[PDB]
Amino acid sequence: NGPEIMSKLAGESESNLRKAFEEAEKNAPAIIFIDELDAIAPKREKTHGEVERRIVSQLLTLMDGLKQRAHVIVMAATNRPNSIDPALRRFGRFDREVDIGIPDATGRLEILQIHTKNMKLADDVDLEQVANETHGHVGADLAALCSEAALQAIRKKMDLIDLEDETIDAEVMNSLAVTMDDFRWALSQSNPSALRETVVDVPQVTWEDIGGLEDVKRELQELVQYPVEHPDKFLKFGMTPSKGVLFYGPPGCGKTLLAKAIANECQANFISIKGPELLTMWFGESEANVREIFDKARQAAPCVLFFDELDSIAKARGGNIGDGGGAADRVINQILTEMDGMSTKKNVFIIGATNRPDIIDPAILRPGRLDQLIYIPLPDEKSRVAILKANLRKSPVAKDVDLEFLAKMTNGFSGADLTEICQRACKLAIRESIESEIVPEIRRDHFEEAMRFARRSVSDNDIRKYEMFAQTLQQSRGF
Amino acid sequence: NRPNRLIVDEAINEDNSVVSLSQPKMDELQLFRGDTVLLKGKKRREAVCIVLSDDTCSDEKIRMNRVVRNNLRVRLGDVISIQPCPDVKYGKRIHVLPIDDTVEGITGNLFEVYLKPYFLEAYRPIRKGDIFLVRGGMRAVEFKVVETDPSPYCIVAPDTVIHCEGEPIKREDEEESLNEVGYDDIGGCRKQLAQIKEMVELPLRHPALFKAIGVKPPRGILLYGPPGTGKTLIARAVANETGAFFFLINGPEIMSKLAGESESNLRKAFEEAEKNAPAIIFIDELDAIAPKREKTHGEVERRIVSQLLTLMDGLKQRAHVIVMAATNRPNSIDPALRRFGRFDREVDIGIPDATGRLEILQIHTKNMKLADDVDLEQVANETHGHVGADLAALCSEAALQAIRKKMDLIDLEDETIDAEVMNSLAVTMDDFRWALSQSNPSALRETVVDVPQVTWEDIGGLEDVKRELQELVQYPVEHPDKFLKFGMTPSKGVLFYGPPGCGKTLLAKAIANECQANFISIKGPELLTMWFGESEANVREIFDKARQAAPCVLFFDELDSIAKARGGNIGDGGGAADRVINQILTEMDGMSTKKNVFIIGATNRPDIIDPAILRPGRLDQLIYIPLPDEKSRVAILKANLRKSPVAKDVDLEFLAKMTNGFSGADLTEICQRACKLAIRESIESEIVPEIRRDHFEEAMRFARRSVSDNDIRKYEMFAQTLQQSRGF
Ligand SMILES: Nc1ncnc2c1ncn2[C@@H]1O[C@H](COP(=O)(O)OP(=O)(O)OP(O)(O)=S)[C@@H](O)[C@H]1O
Ligand SMILES: Nc1ncnc2c1ncn2[C@@H]1O[C@H](COP(=O)(O)OP(=O)(O)OP(O)(O)=S)[C@@H](O)[C@H]1O
Ligand SMILES: Nc1ncnc2c1ncn2[C@@H]1O[C@H](COP(=O)(O)OP(=O)(O)OP(O)(O)=S)[C@@H](O)[C@H]1O
Ligand SMILES: [Mg+2]
Ligand SMILES: [Mg+2]
Ligand SMILES: [Mg+2]
């Protein structure tokens, strides 16, 4: 144990390490597990006492003194891998690194089953729903949630259980069952530890969540699925696949949904890094964080690395023209460096999205970094019908609602505008239900009233400017 | 089975021994309001008391006072055996004796000050060996009957004679000192006390059951909050209200020891706790011994932190040991301590609100005698940044001020004054006003998480935005079933934009008030100064604090100041997005949807607000607050003139039609100027107390318009085209 070793007196912890290694070498094949390795071996550049440096040097010597004949395997665990002294992570000391990441929905469902297999669950307990409703939770968080649910179940059974009795018998303990309400209460007051952690997972949104955009769907399929599914054709014809795609167009037209859906179809890991996130994570002058992003994407291959809201990055210094200076600062140079320095044979795909193509820096568009320029326009008449149908899948829409009428009544609306219209109509239906309580079907009148106050989020001049950039954006770089 | 067992928990009646039951219970046990009941406890002892009729207490619970809780030797959560006693009782002789642990320093005839105005008009029953508490004379003493007629056969009657002995008896170890801190000594923290009880008392009170079940007990409770909020008081109370051995570890006291001797003290404390039954280890000022190991100098301190981590990790479920810690700087604690298995439960003891601080004032003045003009509610309202320690200091200062005016009536030559004059000294409301006049609130800089007082009645007009805010906030928190039926996820953000002084802040505060939800106001200048220290964790702490207060509304006022830090969207060419705004967007995107936190932004510069704020999922409900029209101006004037004695001849609609481009702030300025003219008239006439029509005419003569016509046109332009914004 890290803290247990560090708690000893100076010159006594080294004896403990030597004794542990001697015992491991003596006693057959053995495993040495050093829990919380960062406790005893932090970076020697950032440490105060010489006793700590003696400890680190002793650990290095013991690791280097390991022979193949010893049949001794040393395992270590640390929640701060970057705080570990770099000398430990070299060859011969700690070469294999295993990342125990945050569990996904299926994994956390499995954890919930493992932790509730001892408990008795009521018939209304839906562990799948609980797993879906827990996002930032880890195994410890789920264990705490299960324990809290069991305690809540007990707290309502204090009368059926004779608290005067010293040791209750099992004929009543099994009668106490944990209801889904208890799990809901436990989930209501729970603090997920891994909320801030970046998510590496396959997104749930599929092509059915996207209306229209069939051509870009086909293009994304050809760009992503084919190199990962049929490498033989690519090596036969001799072309190296392009590793980057840039999405540009008016806001709210589905740039994020397209990246998530293409990640879903390939069943590849998806990492979303937003522009504001980069701007705050670099403000601490931490150049290793954006490098860690690319490293994390590398181990998740096949993976798609999606940089959303590049306009926020490009608006940090004004833009390409702006007042005269360039928008390239901070992360973007390191992002370009990482894109140029990533292995081609790796299955990592990089997708960028921005609704400000005017101010995107030219170096992003250079071939070899992001040379597949895909323009997502505003939906046309049929795409608007498709978008409305996709957004109204989960709502009980009445039969008399004419979706194509709404599509032809909206011309310059984007996908976000149509979603806003649907949400406003649903909110009017909710208000109607609330008023009638003091019917549960959204009607034609609700859509008419919502369309009365519907607003257009893209100007005609903006449409013209986007059309201009849709044709001439490859040029950009050069002047 | 046995419909006579009652669950024991603390009462709410601030009086002597009076038990309170639920509505079905007095009918089920055939006892009326003014009836005599008998309480039977453990160790073959009884108690007699008078029931109270209560309805909104619980389904099945008795209410047990702390005065006679020790009389039955029963603690919180215990089971008691009740019995109605329809036996007529009357006292003839009751030999009563105080205890010489709390009556020291009191002389004279203690009956006429303590017992005489406590017995009559009460008719309370007294049992053999009863320890009842009497407050008075700016101190509290408990009292003990030792000899009377056979038990109990005694009630308080005017026909009961008494005689003093002058030799109080000593206190044995069979009973617990009532002078010690209990649950009733803490005010303003009932939710936190409820959480602490739920997390602590069940494992401690039933260690065998918790060992039999084999489930994880929370053993890492960490109290935190501003200094003087009662963390130590809460820990000591929880220790006293449960039969758990309590071992106290002081941060500075441990750190003051020599190197290699503090570790011995920590090990000894943990060994004692493990050995002695269920136990509580309280480490007051945890940051003293365990700061961040990244920021620390000596290796002895790191040894201390590592030893603490090892001791915390060496805790087993069979040990039945709960470790509690208190720190006023939770962020200075080493992060390794706050992980799973060491300190997982965190309880925030925040600044008390007006009701909480009123409760604290009552708790601290219950010993003192207050004059009839003392309005503790007014004192609580007038104290904003005060904490429990601040209020205790205020009460002590008021008592000292009262004494300072009584130095002549009290013989300062006499060694020990008698209580017949001490009770005559009463603390006046003037003394409290003087104490409040010179007092330094410690928690002035702390952010306030409270339900605001301003309601819709403080806002004139704006009916449509009131309805829209109700639909946006109340409905998702009141009827989630409709939302999940229709499949729409509620929007979590609203942006207010419009001309200045039209009620953007009042709307957010009022919608917080109506929902009875916590309200956090963060102003733009506050963000700009709090980020200037390069503290990225502070705006994260704001969102974290809003998360625990759910349902809560997080209001960012004066976003123009944030947007004007770098000029604006166009400006000289650069963007206004800097510093906080990127982290604010990150926090908005990274907050849980099922949480009931609602985010409201306000700005009077919609031109320079950065587009990323308006993206769907962050702040997509764009609500425009215009200048008040004719009827809204009447409503605004009426709302502003609620507290003033406006004369009957004042025509408010005339003023409304005489003001066209005025905002709410302009009308408030007009009302204030008219009131100031009335004040000047009163002052001049002193060398009438009704603001008149002439005052309003004179104020309107100098009334000024704070929004230009060009500004009105520009706001109307942005009122129609602001969703566009983002994109070019
Ligand atoms: N093709 C589409 N089909 C269905 N919904 C869409 C479509 N395009 C946009 N939306 C809606 O618009 C929302 C925003 O989608 P995004 O992919 O984030 O759009 P965007 O192009 O990235 O622009 P922003 O800045 O993110 S709003 C989605 O959550 C949908 O509700
Ligand atoms: N909520 C409260 N109710 C009643 N009295 C209180 C309350 N908070 C504080 N007090 C009084 O103020 C005194 C000081 O409180 P303490 O608990 O000692 O301070 P603290 O909470 O430990 O914070 P520290 O020690 O300065 S970090 C207590 O002894 C009480 O007399
Ligand atoms: N609808 C209203 N009814 C009554 N008083 C109002 C109203 N609108 C504004 N006021 C007055 O104007 C003051 C300022 O209110 P705020 O809500 O802060 O206005 P604002 O829109 O936030 O603009 P500023 O920058 O804060 S003055 C209030 O304290 C009231 O005195
Ligand atoms: Mg997006
Ligand atoms: Mg303390
Ligand atoms: Mg304001």
Numbering used by the authors:
A (entry chain D): 270 to 707, 728 to 768
B (entry chain C): 21 to 707, 728 to 768
Study authors write:
However, when bound to ATPγS, in contrast to displaying the dramatic quaternary structural changes observed in p97WT, the predominant conformation displayed in these two mutants is one in which the N-terminal domain is in the “down” position in a state most closely resembling conformation II of p97WT. These results imply that the mutations decouple ATPγS binding in the D1 domain from inducing the structural rearrangement of N domain from the “down” to “up” conformation. Although we would expect the E470D mutation to have minimal effects because of the conservative substitution, residue 470 is located at a critical juncture between the D1 and D2 domains. Our studies of p97E470D suggest that this residue is extremely important in maintaining the network of interactions by which the structural changes in the D2 domain are communicated to the D1 domain. This could be achieved by destabilizing the D1–D2 linker downstream, leading to inadequate transmission of D2 motion to L464, thereby blocking the critical inter-protomer communication with the adjacent 355–360 residues. Analysis of the p97E470D mutant structure bound to either ATPγS or CB-5083 (data not shown) in the D2 domain appears to show no significant change in the local binding pocket of either nucleotide or drug relative to WT structures, suggesting that the resistance exhibited by this mutant may not be directly related to the changes in binding affinities. Instead p97E470D may exert its effects via changes in the ATPγS-bound conformation by decoupling the D2 domain from the D1 domain, suggesting a second possible mechanism for p97 dysfunction.
